[PDB]
Design a protein around this nucleic acid. Structure first.
Ligand SMILES: [Mg+2]
Ligand SMILES: [Mg+2]
Lengths: 254, 255
DNA sequence: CGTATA
DNA sequence: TACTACG
């Protein structure tokens, strides 16, 4: 009975100032996966660096205050790989692959593609590198859990304004195709196993005050390989917890 | 020799001053050379109206880090060459150094490091200071005359800032920093402004936070220096306090 | 306070 | 509309 939470936290120091630890005390996950920590460990308060009952792993970006992922775990992994083995994709703080034996756990902050053509390219090439990597591991016999911010809504149901954004990165046809392909390689969007409703979102723009209007996108997913699909008992969106432009998502196993 | 006008200005974002009518001011004041620091942009990010100004050749030396540091020079008359570093990698990749050969003189356009945020940055500042001295001395020793302008990030004497006592432990008026200026001057260089003006309350930078500029609670961080052999040629050295757009104001030199 | 990637 | 960096 393992509870895993994924959250693009939009600055760890920022959520801390909004009572992140309190929420983390209340919700007792067995694993906590975070994206966009936007900090080097040394910049973090001591109460955040170490938390009672957990082992903490930080993977910052080389660039200061950019990107970065973190994992808190009640039970240590056998190992923790911080890259795919390709330099350009490995130095932005985007990748945590934690071996818990039963399963590898992928904590990923996938690149946003909105600001440039060259970044959109970076995103898709990251996507590619990711697939090779996760396939290599599942093909070798391992069960995989993949959480994090994918930066893409898959289907029209997955965002409030699908037509206006058909030319916006995050709902480009090229991007949605990749998710299609991803799923075809034997992986399941665990949330879609339990919920087929519309209006289920994980990110809302700050600019519009869109969150109260509920004008969002689903950018955050839990994926498993299908062989492991048996073990997933719950997969939900904690859309009530504030502090970031994303909300956290949840997965329960065994 | 005769009738040459040079302006130095820490512009605090070239795109920023542009939006406040920088070009208009640049039309009005007609300098023969314009030296800028903290452009905070790569040339490609700059409006075409700025990369190409009528009657001037423009040189941009951005930092590797995007939107950080950076210097620029506009000149009516091209230099023979333009060196963009001291030949030491760490000091060369931040956008801090333009050394332009105008034959008569080399012209140093420098954005010296701010030392306030960390011990390690304060250290970077003093080591920059050192590298700079060696460089300017080699050139002066070789016979070359030199004009050095820019944001030194340090007031020299007690008269150089409004509040000297409270800031004696603040980087920008640390004893170690003022000592270096002392040493700098001792190597045969002159603070051209001090040649013509010994009044207090002459400042070039004012903090944004306090709205200090209307209270005139400033520091003098921007200087024109020459080697003493060339001192003969400097006819004027002033502070253009009139000009807004940045937390620094521009300074002027006439030779 | 102010300039500059999600 | 915000978080971050660095001034
Ligand atoms: Mg975000
Ligand atoms: Mg400044």
């Amino acid at each position: 009975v393992l509870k895993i939470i994924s959250w693009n936290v939009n600055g760890l120091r920022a959520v801390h100032r909004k009572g992140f630890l309190k929420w983390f005390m209340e919700e007792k996950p067995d694993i906590l996966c975070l994206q966009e920590i936007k900090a080097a460990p040394e910049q973090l308060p001591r109460k955040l660096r170490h938390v009672e009952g957990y082992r903490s792993f930080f993977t910052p970006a080389e660039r200061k205050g950019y990107s970065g992922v973190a994992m808190y775990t009640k039970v240590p992994p056998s190992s923790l790989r911080e890259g795919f083995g390709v330099e350009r994709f490995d130095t932005e703080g985007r990748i945590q692959i934690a071996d818990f034996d039963d399963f590898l756990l992928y904590n990923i902050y996938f690149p946003n593609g909105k600001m440039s053509e060259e970044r959109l390219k970076y995103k898709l090439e990251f996507y590619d590198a990711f697939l090779e990597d996760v396939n290599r591991e599942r093909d070798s016999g391992r069960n995989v859990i993949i959480c994090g911010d994918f930066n893409t809504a898959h289907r029209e149901i997955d965002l409030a304004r699908p037509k206006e954004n058909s030319n916006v990165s995050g709902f480009l046809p090229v991007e949605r195709a990749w998710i299609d392909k991803f799923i075809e390689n034997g992986y399941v969007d665990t949330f879609r196993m339990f919920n087929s409703d519309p209006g289920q979102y994980t990110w809302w723009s700050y600019r519009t005050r869109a969150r109260e209007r509920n004008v969002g996108w689903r950018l955050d997913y839990f994926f498993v390989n299908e062989e492991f699909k048996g073990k997933v008992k719950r997969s939900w969106i904690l859309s009530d917890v504030m502090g970031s432009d994303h909300c956290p998502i949840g997965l329960e196993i065994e």
